[PDB]
Paper text:
In all, we determined 23 structures, four of them not deposited in the protein data bank. These novel structures represent enzymes involved in stress response, specifically methylglyoxal reductase (YghZ), as well as three enzymes important in core metabolic functions, phosphoglucose isomerase (pGI), 6-phospho-beta-glucosidase (BglA), and glutamate dehydrogenase (GDH). All the proteins are oligomeric (YghZ, pGI, BglA, GDH) and belong to three different fold families. YghZ and BglA have a classic TIM barrel structure, pGI adopts an alpha/beta fold, and GDH possesses a core Rossmann fold found in many nucleotide binding proteins. Based on these experiments, we demonstrate successful structural characterization of multiple proteins using only microgram quantities of purified material.
Glucose-6-phosphate isomerase (pGI) catalyzes the reversible isomerization of D-glucose-6-phosphate to D-fructose-6-phosphate in glycolysis and gluconeogenesis, and facilitates the recycling of hexose-6-phosphate in the pentose phosphate pathway. The protein has an alpha/beta fold with an extensive dimer interface. The active site, identified based on sequence and structural alignments with related proteins, is formed at the dimer interface and comprises residues Arg270, Glu355 and His386, with the active site histidine donated from the partner monomer. The catalytic mechanism is an acid-base type mechanism with Glu355 acting as a putative general base, abstracting a proton from the substrate to facilitate the reversible isomerization of the substrate molecule. Histidine 386 donates a proton, facilitating the ring opening mechanism. As expected from the high sequence identity (over 60% identical), the E. coli pGI dimer aligns extremely well with the mammalian enzyme structures used for molecular replacement.
Numbering used by the authors:
A (entry chain A): 1 to 246, 251 to 549
B (entry chain B): 1 to 549
Write the structure that this text describes.
Amino acid sequence: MKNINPTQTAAWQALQKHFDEMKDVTIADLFAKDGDRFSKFSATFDDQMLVDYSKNRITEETLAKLQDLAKECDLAGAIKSMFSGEKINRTENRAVLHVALRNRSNTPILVDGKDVMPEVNAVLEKMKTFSEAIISGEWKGYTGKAITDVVNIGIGGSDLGPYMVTEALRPYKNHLNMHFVSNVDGTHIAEVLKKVNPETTLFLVASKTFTTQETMTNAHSARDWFLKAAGDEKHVAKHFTALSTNGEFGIDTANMFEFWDWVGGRYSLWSAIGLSIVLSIGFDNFVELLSGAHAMDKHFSTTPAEKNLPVLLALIGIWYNNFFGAETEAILPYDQYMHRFAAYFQQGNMESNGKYVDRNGNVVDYQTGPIIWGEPGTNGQHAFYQLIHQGTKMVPCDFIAPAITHNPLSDHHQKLLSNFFAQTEALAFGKSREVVEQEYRDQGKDPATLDYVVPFKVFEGNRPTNSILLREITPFSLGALIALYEHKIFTQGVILNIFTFDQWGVELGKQLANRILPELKDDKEISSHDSSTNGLINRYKAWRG
Amino acid sequence: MKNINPTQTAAWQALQKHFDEMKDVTIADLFAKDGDRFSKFSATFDDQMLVDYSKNRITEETLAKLQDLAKECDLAGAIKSMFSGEKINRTENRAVLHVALRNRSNTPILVDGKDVMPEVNAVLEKMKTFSEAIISGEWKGYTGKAITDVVNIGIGGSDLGPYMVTEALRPYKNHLNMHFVSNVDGTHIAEVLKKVNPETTLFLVASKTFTTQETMTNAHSARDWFLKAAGDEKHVAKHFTALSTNAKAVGEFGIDTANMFEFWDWVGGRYSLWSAIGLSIVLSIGFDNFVELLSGAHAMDKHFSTTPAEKNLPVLLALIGIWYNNFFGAETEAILPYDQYMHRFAAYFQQGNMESNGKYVDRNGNVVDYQTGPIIWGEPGTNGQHAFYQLIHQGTKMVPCDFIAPAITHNPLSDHHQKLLSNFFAQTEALAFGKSREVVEQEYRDQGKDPATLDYVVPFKVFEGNRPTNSILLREITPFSLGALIALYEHKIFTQGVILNIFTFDQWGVELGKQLANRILPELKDDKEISSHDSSTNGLINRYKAWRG
């Protein structure tokens, strides 16, 4: 696929001059000029997800020039290269096919001359029939009891998605109690072990590689704990399954749910790694989750760029990331269930596009991926919005909300939504000194005596947002929402000329921690490192317990 | 206190020029030129909290110039003003005295000529008595049973502190099951109410005005569920208390105003866990431990108020942060505790830091033309490491990180802790020093491979390092050590506020959102098409009416 340096193109030069003309233009002005602005800068996916990008510092012209850049970088070809199984993960020489995982239409997708769909579909059928055995109570523990608790053990890609989605979709859950263990910090597994009974608990050891130190440390601790009660290791097979590839660990071959190298960790909840999702909400809802991503995959691969939502959001993201130079993006779902959605995308986005060497192997001199953060509304709202309204850093926000709650109480939801609508309105348009002063007059006060407070109550506004309204958070709509960002992330990586699907940047810390661990196993003064590392290691030895 | 524009000082200018000479200097060279660097760029608080700021892009000279800036801005006077009860919160005309809340020494602190310590101590003695009656099972619910569950209902400062701290200190907890509700999203309260029994559940409604919309919406949904079981509002007093000063509203709710625990307007929300607002902390870990939390904050208070600037940890961190915020222009700071129990620590400081210094008008009423508060984020190690560290090591944004870890775990388990800590050590080492292309090529050669045939990968394995960090090693996370750690950051935030010439203790930026949502709520009730706002607010509101059922 093409490896075009976006900064050296004519479209980039044109975006540069446009930015100079645009940089002080105001969102309030853009709305003042065009009364139908919302209808020109919004679109709806599948009659259920409205994406309103109208409160942005953009004109029809900005989008056109940004579309010129996507075309110059051959975005259309990159998309076709991904969906068809071309081996675009060049540093690892791999296909990138999380789209095959949810390919409900079952069109063949080839890797090394072979259709991947039959194996994709076999693992799924296996997850269905396994989940039925667990959920129905047909599958029994070692003392002949039904499973009540399922404990996922994994880190990164094997943890954030399954945790995020089972939380997001609690309204769809069955009776099984779900736990997600990931930190090597012992408190994580210890806090779980003390709540669960060895005879009714199912562990899933999730790990692309099955070598990860954290996951295997945790899996071994769970194994040990289990055996302290069960006594005999023949019982392990009723209580442990694997989500990976590697068996002497003690897991029945038949208990191994496989996935493939062309499945990135941070794009893996759709595969065998999603079993904890299947066990929590059942196989049908999992398939609904797959179906939603699929419909969004279809939208992305067949919709013309001007009406293509992943592209539009990607392009708007680039305008701020690369022309305004904002470092961050906030993701703010007005939905407590979705309290882990921002966190998931910290890996989805930052591990994909947090890169500095281009597809041609050259260090870049322009910005790559942004820093993703956020908490759900209204929680985030009462923590850190002060800075978003009145700080000195521009933070583009995505506000997300369902029209329908799963927990309707009094007027909670209308109160929740009123903030959803109000915050973006506030961010865009602000509140001038004259309005501030007029409020003080309406109280019979003379604002001239209030210079100590008045200037601090002014909101400059002009702060951009997207708003995403869905009918309701369903497995299907959530599936669609996740993939929407997956493909924004894709689109940004193609344009920024980087490799969105590898992650060599995690290596050095693992290798450095590898050298350090053995040094902790004696009572000796360490001096093989720089003076800081030495200092900290030696103080630890002096203070440890 | 003084309101000096930092950008107009000789110190600011000497820093600008120093940065022009420093901007390309690497941490590797800083460490190679002086083997004693660690010892010159680190200090320990109270024989228990080592703060290592050596892996930073700083020299002795950088620190001298940053100190010069704090002097020119009268940091010392500002500190004396806060601690003495001067009304430094000028936009609201208030004192700023969270230091009084934990002032164990009981030296008088006067506001409007009156010592605040008596009232402070009186609320604490009342929290003590109440907590003992709850914890001991002496206080019975409407059916005569001891309490088993405590649900806190609050937003922002009434939620983040209590929750963060009860989590961080779970090893010190008693038998009480704690719950924290804050979102106006009905899910939040609903998920709690389905897991608790009305006869053994105690609610804490945390809200100074006792009119806060989210909190009172939640409190009222709880009252409703409670009465649907109890059948009589006379039992409210056994199951609801208030952290508030509005006696009229509290009493009307059905709560015995004897169980109104109060605080004062010189207690900011985002500094309120040390007050009445921390009742749930007292209930979860006991009054003894809460007092240890207090004493740890007080020891840090003494440190901040009495240590020379050159060894004053909140000041040093604050200055270093300013070097990156204002001279490097980094937008963010990550707080990364290698401790699962502290998983809400970073989130806590998104408020404490960002609502504090996320400001754009200086203390003289003039709009700033320089950077103020940074954006705070983070997840506990090792989780964040497998999520976002790729961008911190290999992205194009510089992210100063504070790595934090205890040397003792409360959950010892084979070699789990040693592994945890090996990551804590290794990550800052990796970020400071990196890994050259030469080293990468040598690794292949030693495999007997020809790195010339490996162009498709070699360039991508190079770590250019020179990414700064602080490392905070504690003996152990205790109520005391945690009290001091929270206070360290509170005073870092103060120092930055002072220097940056802004108002650290107000939050006028929250008002607009609130007035616009107030206008919008009644419009959500009918089926009328809405056209009272901009086209987009209208469009979203109307789509919502089409889709809501």
